[PDB]
Scaffold this active site. Sequence first.
Site, short mmCIF file in Angstrom:
data_model
loop_
_atom_site.label_atom_id
_atom_site.label_comp_id
_atom_site.label_asym_id
_atom_site.label_seq_id
_atom_site.Cartn_x
_atom_site.Cartn_y
_atom_site.Cartn_z
CD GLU A 28 -2.17 1.85 0.16
OE1 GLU A 28 -2.54 3.13 0.14
OE2 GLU A 28 -2.65 0.92 -0.55
CG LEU A 88 -2.78 -3.24 -2.37
CD1 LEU A 88 -2.46 -3.49 -0.97
CD2 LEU A 88 -3.78 -4.80 -2.55
CG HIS A 89 -8.08 -1.02 -6.60
ND1 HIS A 89 -7.92 -2.21 -7.28
CD2 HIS A 89 -7.55 0.09 -7.06
CE1 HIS A 89 -6.93 -1.92 -8.34
NE2 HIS A 89 -6.79 -0.75 -8.31
N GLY A 90 -9.24 0.43 -2.51
CA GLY A 90 -10.10 0.40 -1.01
C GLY A 90 -9.23 0.37 0.25
CB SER A 94 -5.04 6.87 6.74
OG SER A 94 -6.50 6.43 6.01
#
EC number: 5.6.2.2
Lengths: 191, 189
Positions: A28, A88-90, A94
Amino acid sequence: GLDAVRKRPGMYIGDTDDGTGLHHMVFEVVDNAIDEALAGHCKEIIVTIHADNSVSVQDDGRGIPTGVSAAEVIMTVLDNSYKVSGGLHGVGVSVVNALSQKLELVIQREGKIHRQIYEHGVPQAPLAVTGETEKTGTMVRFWPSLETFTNVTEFEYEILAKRLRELSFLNSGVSIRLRDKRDGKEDHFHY
Amino acid sequence: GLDAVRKRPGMYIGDTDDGTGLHHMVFEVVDNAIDEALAGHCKEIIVTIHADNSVSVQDDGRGIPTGIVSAAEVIMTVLKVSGGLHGVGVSVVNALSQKLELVIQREGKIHRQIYEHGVPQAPLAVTGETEKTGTMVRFWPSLETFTNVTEFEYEILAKRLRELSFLNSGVSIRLRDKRDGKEDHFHYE
Ligand SMILES: CNc1cc(F)cc2c1[nH]c1nc(Oc3cnc(C)nc3)nc(N3C[C@H]4CCN[C@H]4C3)c12
Ligand SMILES: CNc1cc(F)cc2c1[nH]c1nc(Oc3cnc(C)nc3)nc(N3C[C@H]4CCN[C@H]4C3)c12
């Protein structure tokens, strides 16, 4: 908020008990660096496995804006994730912050070095100036939460090398260096 | 939180104003069918462009489990494929669909549930009997989310479906385009 992430970590980052989520944490962060590379600003990304259970990802792009700082907002508030092929999605960075025992953000921008530390996604202090530089870019280094991740709690060279090679192929032109200070290994991926 | 997906779709589905997000919606559903093929249960996937602004994806795999809310409903409503959209599930597609239809053939029955903007219209219901198995998802994209390109385009689907079939060798994908009278079949081994 990040409280929801800490409560149900696997939902947000992947299985926390078999190393999958743990390595997603790195990917990420890498995705953010590749995004900045594809925007034409970063020519080099460096991923480093340190001997202290952290991984850093560094780019030489614009540096996240620092004038709380926009940088802190990016790190703490739970945006197109499709610029990075294989990204990566979603999930945003954070989530990585929420699930890190410690996260360090170092930004080189507009002549200054800035740093902020968080613990479990909570800042220790406002972003602060820590030097001067003519360079630019963003460095995130994180230590995974040991409350969150079990069984596989250390980053593995082979998992990182295999995926970073794949990401370099999927995002042709992006140069990624993997440095492993724990194990004395290094690779360069660039197609 | 499907409301989060509607509110800020970029992180989940991509650009909603240039057709890329719209087509990602199809690929996400297809990824679920490919997963069932990689699991060794699905042999054939059929992707259909209908003339009513919907795309259906049908597989001949096990069918999503229907017992109890049903397991199927949770998959649709609650937030290993090479080239798959990693980190998103079909509930994202559901969230961003004006209408979504799920039809499952499993354990001798046909089961159906419809959703609007990711909220079910009714409890999953039996709608037939069958000797076949599999899952069909058909969806109509939300025009509150997608703009400019709001119709599925054959060429985008053909190009990516061919790639997905190569990247996940063994599965047979048929693209049927009833709106435009076109068809192709992708299958690598
Ligand atoms: C390890 N590296 C790393 C790690 C990381 F976690 C984040 C960044 C990161 N490098 C970054 N560079 C920029 O550059 C920008 C500067 N200014 C603007 C307007 N956009 C992007 N922005 C960054 N941001 C702002 C958002 C834009 C898309 N992704 C989000 C993270 C990062
Ligand atoms: C258009 N096709 C389609 C579309 C779709 F949106 C979902 C499925 C889908 N086909 C499916 N087949 C199965 O099969 C299973 C049955 N039983 C189990 C235990 N696993 C998978 N499961 C499905 N599920 C259950 C989860 C397992 C991995 N992906 C999730 C969606 C689907």
